[PDB]
Every structure is written in structure tokens, then in C-alpha cells.
Amino acid sequence: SGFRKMAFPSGKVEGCMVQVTCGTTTLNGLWLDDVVYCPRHVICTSEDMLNPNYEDLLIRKSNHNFLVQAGNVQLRVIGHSMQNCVLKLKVDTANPKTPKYKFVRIQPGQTFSVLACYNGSPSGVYQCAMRPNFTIKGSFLNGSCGSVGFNIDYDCVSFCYMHHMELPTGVHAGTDLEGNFYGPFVDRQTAQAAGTDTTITVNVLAWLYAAVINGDRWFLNRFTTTLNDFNLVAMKYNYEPLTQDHVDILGPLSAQTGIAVLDMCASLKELLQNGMNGRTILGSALLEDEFTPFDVVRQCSGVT
Amino acid sequence: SGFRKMAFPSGKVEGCMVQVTCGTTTLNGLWLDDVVYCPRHVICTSEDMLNPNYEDLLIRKSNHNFLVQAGNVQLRVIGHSMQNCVLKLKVDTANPKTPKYKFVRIQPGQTFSVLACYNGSPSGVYQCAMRPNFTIKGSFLNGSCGSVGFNIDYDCVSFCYMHHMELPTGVHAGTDLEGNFYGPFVDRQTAQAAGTDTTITVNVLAWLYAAVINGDRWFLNRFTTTLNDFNLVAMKYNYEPLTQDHVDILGPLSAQTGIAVLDMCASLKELLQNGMNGRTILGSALLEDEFTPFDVVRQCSGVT
Ligand SMILES: CN1CCCc2ccc(S(N)(=O)=O)cc21
Numbered sequence: 139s140g141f142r143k144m145a146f147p148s149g150k151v152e153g154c155m156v157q158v159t160c161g162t163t164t165l166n167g168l169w170l171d172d173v174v175y176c177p178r179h180v181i182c183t184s185e186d187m188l189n190p191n192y193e194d195l196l197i198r199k200s201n202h203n204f205l206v207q208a209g210n211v212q213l214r215v216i217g218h219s220m221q222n223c224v225l226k227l228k229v230d231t232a233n234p235k236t237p238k239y240k241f242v243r244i245q246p247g248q249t250f251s252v253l254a255c256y257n258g259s260p261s262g263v264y265q266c267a268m269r270p271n272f273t274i275k276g277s278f279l280n281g282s283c284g285s286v287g288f289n290i291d292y293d294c295v296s297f298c299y300m301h302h303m304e305l306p307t308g309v310h311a312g313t314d315l316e317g318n319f320y321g322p323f324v325d326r327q328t329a330q331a332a333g334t335d336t337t338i339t340v341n342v343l344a345w346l347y348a349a350v351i352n353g354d355r356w357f358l359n360r361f362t363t364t365l366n367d368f369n370l371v372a373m374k375y376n377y378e379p380l381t382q383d384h385v386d387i388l389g390p391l392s393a394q395t396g397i398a399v400l401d402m403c404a405s406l407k408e409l410l411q412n413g414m415n416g417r418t419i420l421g422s423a424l425l426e427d428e429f430t431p432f433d434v435v436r437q438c439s440g441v442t
Numbered sequence: 443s444g445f446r447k448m449a450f451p452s453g454k455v456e457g458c459m460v461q462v463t464c465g466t467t468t469l470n471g472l473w474l475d476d477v478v479y480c481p482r483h484v485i486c487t488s489e490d491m492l493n494p495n496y497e498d499l500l501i502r503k504s505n506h507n508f509l510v511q512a513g514n515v516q517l518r519v520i521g522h523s524m525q526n527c528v529l530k531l532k533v534d535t536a537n538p539k540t541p542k543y544k545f546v547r548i549q550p551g552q553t554f555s556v557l558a559c560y561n562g563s564p565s566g567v568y569q570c571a572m573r574p575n576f577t578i579k580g581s582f583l584n585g586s587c588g589s590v591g592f593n594i595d596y597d598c599v600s601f602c603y604m605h606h607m608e609l610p611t612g613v614h615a616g617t618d619l620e621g622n623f624y625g626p627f628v629d630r631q632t633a634q635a636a637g638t639d640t641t642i643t644v645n646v647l648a649w650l651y652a653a654v655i656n657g658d659r660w661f662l663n664r665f666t667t668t669l670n671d672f673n674l675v676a677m678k679y680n681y682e683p684l685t686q687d688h689v690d691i692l693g694p695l696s697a698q699t700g701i702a703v704l705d706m707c708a709s710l711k712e713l714l715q716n717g718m719n720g721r722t723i724l725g726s727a728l729l730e731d732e733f734t735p736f737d738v739v740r741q742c743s744g745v746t
């Protein structure tokens with residue numbers, strides 16, 4: 139029993155982290171097979187960062203200008219290319235610690251683990267959600283760029299996120315491992331606003347199921363409701379609209395707990411209209427939305 | 443910027459986790475050099491668990507009754523002993539993935555990372571505190587026993603916790619790696635109560651410093667106070683008494699933020715007497731106490 143914001147074990151990713159230096163700028167890269175992936179803003183000087191022409195900047199750069207260090211050993215760079223906002227550095231050695239892996243572009247509301255790194259060295263691991271507005275609420279300092287988000291399915295690491303920047307609001311913006319930004323963000327030092335950040339309704343409901351499972355049931359009420367009625371209340375509180383896809387994904391938790399999704403929606407409705415009255419759920423004084431239904435099933439069943 | 447309940451990267455510990463089976467019971471062990479450490483309740487049948495004589499039970503057991511599997515490879519057991527509540531299984535192979543490590547008995551209020559494991563397989567990592575009452579609020583299912591808590595200092599893993607049981611209240615009790623329980627707990631299936639759980643005052647203050655650093659300053663007030671006045675209010679709210687040792691440990695954060703410890707104590711006082719009035723601090727609707735001053739400095743500076 140108990141419920142924790144739990145990250146994937148980070149070992150398979152720790153073996154993939156390198157330091158990439160171009161000119162004076164150092165950040166993190168991901169060494170998989172004989173390719174090192176890093177943010178392309180590695181090639182920028184703080185004066186380029188305002189309005190960079192990445193094509194023109196990269197033209198000034200040769201294989202040998204890219205210093206790739208794995209722990210204390212240097213990698214030989216035999217090729218470089220830009221794909222969207224990532225640089226791919228062809229090295230002459232396959233990373234011997236390359237896990238089975240995939241590149242996946244995650245959907246907003248989905249969760250992943252972040253291995254925050256500095257100078258190619260792992261410092262810590264936490265669990266994140268892709269906000270509906272395609273930002274993450276991370277913990278990233280200077281040099282953390284190139285730090286990656288991932289999920290693990292048994293032996294396979296699905297890389298979904300590479301850290302590129304902090305917006306002036308202190309939220310975090312980044313790419314998939316094909317270097318396409320999540321959201322409308324560009325890799326340029328300019329004022330960029332994220333949309334309205336909504337609450338991930340299906341995740342909050344999943345967490346309410348986690349709570350009931352773990353003995354926190356005070357918020358269970360005598361009421362039920364309808365998708366349309368629930369979504370009237372979701373609208374008011376900047377919650378994501380609940381669809382039948384969400385209901386379907388909650389079915390395993392519905393089944394285990396014997397609490398119908400729409401009854402739990404009515405619990406959530408009352409919680410939104412009435413607040414928590416100084417009570418807590420799983421040691422939280424607000425509605426948690428960074429657990430997917432999948433995360434609750436995994437944690438509450440014991441998937442390794 | 444940003445602040446996250448961040449765990450140590452778990453790779454060095456993932457390489458140490460094994461499956462230990464005695465009779466029908468399987469749990470997790472820690473393979474360091476040529477010794478596998480696991481909870482001694484591995485030798486108990488569910489009928490022994492009520493009033494076990496571990497000495498008499500262990501006498502029935504031979505080296506070959508202890509099945510130690512590392513991933514898919516079996517380890518040969520050449521020696522067994524009981525130290526307090528842990529079994530030490532001498533194997534004939536040094537773990538080649540043994541990190542530089544130490545066994546440390548942590549103090550209540552200190553924090554560590556937990557690699558939750560099932561059948562010697564890592565499932566997830568989260569950050570914990572040793573509660574003042576020597577329990578942890580974990581996420582542990584059947585088979586999670588032998589899962590370890592740790593800190594990392596650059597290349598050295600300090601093992602501080604081995605998971606033994608869940609109390610009927612759903613909090614978690616365990617040992618150091620010399621198998622001495624944290625708190626008054628015994629490895630017997632009987633009703634065991636934890637003391638009053640207090641809030642770790644020095645940690646909450648550390649977190650208030652993390653908040654100011656990260657731009658959440660609304661709770662900063664015009665008031666100051668005294669250790670004795672603050673501790674009158676700590677008493678009322680089941681907060682740990684603040685000593686000059688705590689103040690000293692906060693000095694780096696005091697210095698960076700230019701906010702005197704006793705002024706922050708006055709902020710905290712007002713927060714305890716008045717609550718958060720539906721506001722949040724670092725995305726939290728209550729006072730967080732599972733960050734040490736050391737954790738805030740590490741996270742807010744970028745220690746790898
Ligand atoms: C410094 N650099 C690198 C990558 C692109 C980018 C985007 C926004 C900002 S910001 N708003 O912090 O100055 C800074 C930045």
C-alpha cells in the first residue's frame with residue numbers, strides 16, 4: 139500500500155548520457171548506437187540565441203568542433219546533421235550500454251520520467267506530465283539542456299522528450315527525439331507564452347481510483363452524473379473534457395474498485411465545486427493529475 | 443528553475459538487486475561484493491510470521507535452501523548468517539556491478555531514494571523521508587521486501603534502508619543494512635503502532651527557501667520571531683522543535699536568499715496559524731517536509 143509519484147529506474151538512460159561541447163557551450167547528449175543526439179542550440183553563442191540562423195551557424199562547424207565526452211573517454215565524430223531542432227552526431231563507436239529503445243512522440247496528459255543531467259552526468263530523476271499546453275513543470279538549471287524524458291516497457295526505453303529551454307514563466311519546453319517541439323515553441327531566446335494549462339481530468343480520476351484502492355475514500359459521495367453534466371463542470375474549472383475514450387481507459391480501475399466512472403466523476407464534481415475542506419487525499423491538499431490510468435494500474439499491481 | 447521531489451539516479455542500485463527465495467517465499471536482496479543481504483523473514487512461512495523464533499527457523503536451513511538469482515543467472519551460496527533482522531548470504535561470486543558503497547544509519551528527518559523492486563527486478567524510484575517516528579510513507583506491495591533506500595555522494599552509494607513490512611496503518615517499517623530496525627518495530631506479524639508523526643520543521647523551512655529562490659514569495663511577511671516563540675507554535679502544530687543546529691544548517695539558504703532564518707520562521711508561524719488560504723507554494727497546498735536543507739542546495743545549485 140501507499141502511493142508515490144514514482145519514476146522509472148534510470149539506469150538504462152544513465153548509460154546513454156554524454157557531455158557535448160561546441161565552442162564555449164556544454165550540454166547533455168543521448169548516445170544510442172553510433173549517434174549522439176543533443177539540442178541544436180549547442181552551436182549558438184549567447185548573441186546568436188536572440189535570432190539564430192541554425193543552417194548558417196551549423197555551416198561554420200566541422201565534425202571536430204563537436205567535442206563528445208562519455209564519462210572521461212572522448213568520442214570521435216565522423217558525421218553531423220540537423221534534424222528539426224536536434225543535432226545528430228555520428229560517432230565511430232556504438233554505445234555498448236545502448237538499451238533496446240524507441241523514439242515516441244507522447245500525447246499531452248501522458249507521463250514520463252526525466253533524468254536531469256549536468257555535463258553529461260545524471261543528478262536526479264522525477265516523474266512528469268506533458269501539460270495539455272505542451273509544457274512540463276520540471277527542475278532544470280543551466281547545462282540541463284539535452285536531459286531526456288522516457289518510459290520503460292520491460293527492457294525497452296521509449297525516449298519521448300529532450301529538454302531545450304525554460305520559458306520566462308519558469309515552465310519547460312522541449313522536443314521529441316526527432317527534434318520536433320512539443321507545442322508552438324521555437325529554439326530562440328524570445329518571449330513565448332504557453333496556452334491556458336488545463337487539468338488532465340482522466341489522470342485526476344485515475345488518482346481518485348488509486349486513493350480508494352489505498353483506503354482514502356472520504357470524498358466518495360451518494361451522487362452520480364452524466365458525461366455532459368460532468369463536462370459542464372470540467373469547462374468551468376479548466377479541466378480537459380472527459381470523452382468515452384477516457385472512460386474506457388478507466389475501466390480496469392472501475393472494475394477493480396467496483397465504482398462506476400460516472401459516480402467517480404460525481405465525486406470529482408463535488409470536490410471541484412466544494413474544494414477539499416482542509417482534508418487531504420493520498421497526502422495531497424489538491425487534485426493530482428500527473429498519474430495516468432496506466433500509472434495507477436502499474437503502481438497498484440506491481441509491474442517491473 | 444522549478445522544484446521537484448527528485449530521486450537519485452538508481453542505476454548503481456539496479457545493478458545490485460537480486461531475487462532471494464527460501465521455501466515458497468521470494469523477496470529482494472542486495473548483492474554487494476560476495477554477500478547478498480535480505481530480510482530474515484524470507485525463512486518464515488505465513489504461520490511462522492505470527493511469533494517466529496528466527497534462530498530455531500534458520501537452524502532448519504542450509505546454504506542450498508537459499509536460491510539467489512541475479513537477473514536470470516543463479517548464485518552459489520557458500521555461507522549464511524543472521525545479523526539482527528537481515529540474512530547475509532555469502533555467494534562465491536563478487537557482484538561485478540558493486541558500486542563504491544557504505545552502510546549508514548540515517549537520522550529521522552533525513553531523506554533518501556527508494557528503488558521499489560519485485561522478484562529482484564526494479565519497478566520504480568521515489569524520494570522519501572525517515573519520519574520522526576521512524577516510519578516511511580512508501581509505495582510497497584507483496585514481494586517489495588528487501589527493496590533498499592540510499593543516497594549517492596558522487597560515485598559512492600550510502601545504503602540506509604531495507605524494506606521489511608507495512609504496519610496495519612499502511613506506513614512502512616524497515617532496517618539499516620546491519621538489520622537494526624528504525625524505530626521500535628519487530629519483524630513479527632503483530633499490531634505495532636508508530637508514535638505521533640511530527641513535521642520536520644527544518645525541512646519545511648528549507649522548502650520555503652526553495653520556494654523564494656524559485657519566485658514563490660507570497661508567504662513572506664513583515665514579521666520576525668524568536669526560537670522560543672517559534673517553538674511555542676511548533677509545539678501546538680506537532681512540528682519538531684527548531685534548535686540552533688537546524689538554524690546553522692539553514693545558513694547557506696539564509697545567505698543566498700538574504701532572508702534571516704528567524705524571519706522565515708515568522709513566515710512559517712503565520713502559515714501554521716492562518717493556513718494557505720487556498721494558495722499554493724511550489725504547486726503544493728500544504729507545507730512539504732521531505733526536502734532537507736542539503737536537498738534544496740543540491741537541487742537549486744545542480745550537484746551531479
Ligand atoms: C538561451 N536560449 C537557448 C534556447 C532557446 C531559448 C528560448 C527561450 C529563452 S528565455 N525566454 O529563457 O530567455 C532562452 C533560450
Ligand SMILES: CN1CCCc2ccc(S(N)(=O)=O)cc21
Nearest residue numbers: 483491607608610629630631632
Ligand atoms: C507478514 N509479515 C512479515 C514481516 C513481519 C510483519 C510485521 C507486520 C505485519 S502486518 N501488521 O501487516 O500484518 C506483517 C508481517
